[PDB]
Design a protein around this ligand. Structure first.
Ligand SMILES: Brc1ccc([C@H]2C3=C(N=C4NC=NN42)c2ccccc2O[C@@H]3c2ccc(Br)cc2)cc1
Length: 93
C-alpha cells in the first residue's frame, strides 16, 4: 500500500538502525526504502521474530528491533505503520 515513488526515497539510517542492517549483510550508509525493508526482512527471517502460525505477526519485544520500532509486536500487513516506524530511525536525504 505504499506508492513505488516512496520506497525509492533515498535515505540513511541512524547509528544502530544501521547496526541492525550491517549485521545481516549491509555495507553501505545510504539506502533506498526498500533496500532497508529488504534487509529488515532478512533480519526478521534469520532471528525468526515472526509467529510460527500466523507469520504476518512479528515479535520484537526482547530484541533490538523492538527498541528501534518502539512496539512489542506488529503486523507486516500494515505497511504505512511500518514505514513511519522506520522513518524515525533515519534522515530523508
Ligand atoms: Br512495509 C513491508 C514491505 C515488505 C513486507 C514483506 C515482508 C514479509 N511478509 C510480507 N507480505 C507481503 N509483503 N511482505 C515478511 C514476513 C515475515 C518475515 C520477513 C518478512 O519480510 C518482509 C518484512 C516485514 C516487516 C519488515 Br519491518 C520488513 C520486511 C512487509 C512490509
Amino acid at each position: 500500500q505504499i506508492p513505488a515513488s516512496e520506497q525509492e526515497t533515498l535515505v540513511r539510517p541512524k547509528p544502530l538502525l544501521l547496526k541492525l542492517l550491517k549485521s545481516v549483510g549491509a555495507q553501505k550508509d545510504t539506502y533506498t526504502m526498500k533496500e532497508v525493508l529488504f534487509y529488515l526482512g532478512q533480519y526478521i527471517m534469520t532471528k525468526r521474530l515472526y509467529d510460527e502460525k500466523q507469520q504476518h505477526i512479528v515479535y520484537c519485544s526482547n530484541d533490538l528491533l523492538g527498541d528501534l520500532f518502539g512496539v512489542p509486536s506488529f503486523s507486516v500487513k500494515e505497511h504505512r505503520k511500518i514505514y513511519t516506524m522506520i522513518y524515525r530511525n533515519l534522515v530523508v536525504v
